[PDB]
mmCIF file of all heavy atoms in Angstrom:
data_model
loop_
_atom_site.group_PDB
_atom_site.id
_atom_site.type_symbol
_atom_site.label_atom_id
_atom_site.label_comp_id
_atom_site.label_asym_id
_atom_site.label_seq_id
_atom_site.Cartn_x
_atom_site.Cartn_y
_atom_site.Cartn_z
ATOM 1 N N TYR E 100 -0.580 38.377 -7.421
ATOM 2 C CA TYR E 100 0.060 37.083 -7.606
ATOM 3 C C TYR E 100 1.064 37.141 -8.740
ATOM 4 O O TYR E 100 2.202 36.675 -8.584
ATOM 5 C CB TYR E 100 -0.986 35.999 -7.880
ATOM 6 C CG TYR E 100 -1.916 35.643 -6.727
ATOM 7 C CD1 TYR E 100 -2.934 34.718 -6.911
ATOM 8 C CD2 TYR E 100 -1.762 36.190 -5.456
ATOM 9 C CE1 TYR E 100 -3.782 34.370 -5.881
ATOM 10 C CE2 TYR E 100 -2.606 35.842 -4.421
ATOM 11 C CZ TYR E 100 -3.610 34.929 -4.638
ATOM 12 O OH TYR E 100 -4.456 34.582 -3.612
ATOM 13 N N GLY E 101 0.724 37.843 -9.823
ATOM 14 C CA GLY E 101 1.663 37.934 -10.923
ATOM 15 C C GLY E 101 2.948 38.615 -10.512
ATOM 16 O O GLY E 101 4.035 38.068 -10.719
ATOM 17 N N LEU E 102 2.831 39.680 -9.718
ATOM 18 C CA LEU E 102 4.029 40.384 -9.286
ATOM 19 C C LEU E 102 4.869 39.509 -8.380
ATOM 20 O O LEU E 102 6.096 39.448 -8.540
ATOM 21 C CB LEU E 102 3.654 41.684 -8.580
ATOM 22 C CG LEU E 102 3.048 42.789 -9.443
ATOM 23 C CD1 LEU E 102 2.510 43.879 -8.556
ATOM 24 C CD2 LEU E 102 4.066 43.364 -10.415
ATOM 25 N N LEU E 103 4.215 38.711 -7.535
ATOM 26 C CA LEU E 103 4.973 37.863 -6.632
ATOM 27 C C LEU E 103 5.791 36.858 -7.418
ATOM 28 O O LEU E 103 7.002 36.723 -7.182
ATOM 29 C CB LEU E 103 4.027 37.155 -5.662
ATOM 30 C CG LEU E 103 3.316 38.029 -4.624
ATOM 31 C CD1 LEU E 103 2.246 37.241 -3.896
ATOM 32 C CD2 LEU E 103 4.298 38.601 -3.637
ATOM 33 N N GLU E 104 5.210 36.320 -8.493
ATOM 34 C CA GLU E 104 5.951 35.373 -9.312
ATOM 35 C C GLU E 104 7.181 36.022 -9.914
ATOM 36 O O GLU E 104 8.301 35.524 -9.713
ATOM 37 C CB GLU E 104 5.030 34.840 -10.410
ATOM 38 C CG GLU E 104 5.595 33.747 -11.301
ATOM 39 C CD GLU E 104 4.696 33.480 -12.488
ATOM 40 O OE1 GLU E 104 3.688 32.763 -12.316
ATOM 41 O OE2 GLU E 104 4.991 33.988 -13.590
ATOM 42 N N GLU E 105 7.033 37.244 -10.431
ATOM 43 C CA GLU E 105 8.186 37.875 -11.055
ATOM 44 C C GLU E 105 9.257 38.163 -10.026
ATOM 45 O O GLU E 105 10.436 37.857 -10.260
ATOM 46 C CB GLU E 105 7.787 39.161 -11.782
ATOM 47 C CG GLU E 105 6.592 39.028 -12.705
ATOM 48 C CD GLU E 105 6.325 40.292 -13.499
ATOM 49 O OE1 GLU E 105 6.940 41.333 -13.186
ATOM 50 O OE2 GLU E 105 5.494 40.245 -14.431
ATOM 51 N N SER E 106 8.850 38.590 -8.828
ATOM 52 C CA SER E 106 9.852 38.894 -7.821
ATOM 53 C C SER E 106 10.660 37.663 -7.461
ATOM 54 O O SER E 106 11.899 37.701 -7.512
ATOM 55 C CB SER E 106 9.183 39.469 -6.576
ATOM 56 O OG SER E 106 10.146 39.761 -5.581
ATOM 57 N N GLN E 107 9.994 36.517 -7.282
ATOM 58 C CA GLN E 107 10.771 35.342 -6.915
ATOM 59 C C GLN E 107 11.685 34.921 -8.047
ATOM 60 O O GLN E 107 12.837 34.542 -7.801
ATOM 61 C CB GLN E 107 9.870 34.187 -6.480
ATOM 62 C CG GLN E 107 10.650 32.955 -5.976
ATOM 63 C CD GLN E 107 11.461 33.231 -4.728
ATOM 64 O OE1 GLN E 107 11.214 34.203 -4.018
ATOM 65 N NE2 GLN E 107 12.426 32.365 -4.447
ATOM 66 N N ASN E 108 11.227 35.061 -9.297
ATOM 67 C CA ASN E 108 12.085 34.659 -10.400
ATOM 68 C C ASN E 108 13.358 35.481 -10.408
ATOM 69 O O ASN E 108 14.463 34.920 -10.433
ATOM 70 C CB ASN E 108 11.341 34.813 -11.725
ATOM 71 C CG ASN E 108 10.278 33.754 -11.927
ATOM 72 O OD1 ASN E 108 10.290 32.710 -11.276
ATOM 73 N ND2 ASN E 108 9.354 34.014 -12.842
ATOM 74 N N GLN E 109 13.232 36.779 -10.126
ATOM 75 C CA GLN E 109 14.419 37.617 -10.118
ATOM 76 C C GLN E 109 15.311 37.236 -8.958
ATOM 77 O O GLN E 109 16.527 37.069 -9.128
ATOM 78 C CB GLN E 109 14.023 39.087 -10.047
ATOM 79 C CG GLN E 109 13.342 39.584 -11.305
ATOM 80 C CD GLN E 109 12.903 41.026 -11.198
ATOM 81 O OE1 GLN E 109 13.434 41.790 -10.395
ATOM 82 N NE2 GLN E 109 11.927 41.408 -12.011
ATOM 83 N N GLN E 110 14.691 36.907 -7.826
ATOM 84 C CA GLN E 110 15.468 36.538 -6.659
ATOM 85 C C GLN E 110 16.249 35.267 -6.926
ATOM 86 O O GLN E 110 17.443 35.200 -6.602
ATOM 87 C CB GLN E 110 14.547 36.375 -5.450
ATOM 88 C CG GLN E 110 15.142 35.600 -4.285
ATOM 89 C CD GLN E 110 14.314 35.735 -3.030
ATOM 90 O OE1 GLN E 110 13.945 36.839 -2.638
ATOM 91 N NE2 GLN E 110 14.024 34.612 -2.384
ATOM 92 N N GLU E 111 15.650 34.303 -7.633
ATOM 93 C CA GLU E 111 16.406 33.081 -7.865
ATOM 94 C C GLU E 111 17.601 33.355 -8.761
ATOM 95 O O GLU E 111 18.723 32.947 -8.426
ATOM 96 C CB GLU E 111 15.505 31.995 -8.452
ATOM 97 C CG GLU E 111 14.478 31.464 -7.455
ATOM 98 C CD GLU E 111 13.697 30.269 -7.972
ATOM 99 O OE1 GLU E 111 14.174 29.597 -8.907
ATOM 100 O OE2 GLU E 111 12.605 29.996 -7.430
ATOM 101 N N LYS E 112 17.438 34.228 -9.761
ATOM 102 C CA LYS E 112 18.594 34.554 -10.585
ATOM 103 C C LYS E 112 19.637 35.284 -9.775
ATOM 104 O O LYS E 112 20.828 34.950 -9.848
ATOM 105 C CB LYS E 112 18.213 35.395 -11.804
ATOM 106 C CG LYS E 112 17.385 34.685 -12.879
ATOM 107 C CD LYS E 112 18.209 33.627 -13.674
ATOM 108 C CE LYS E 112 19.526 34.130 -14.336
ATOM 109 N NZ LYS E 112 20.497 33.022 -14.491
#
Side-chain angles (χ1 to χ4, degrees):
Chain E
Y100 292 177
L102 291 170
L103 292 170
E104 185 190 280
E105 311 186 349
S106 180
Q107 185 63 19
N108 287 342
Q109 292 178 23
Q110 162 167 311
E111 290 187 21
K112 291 289 306 153

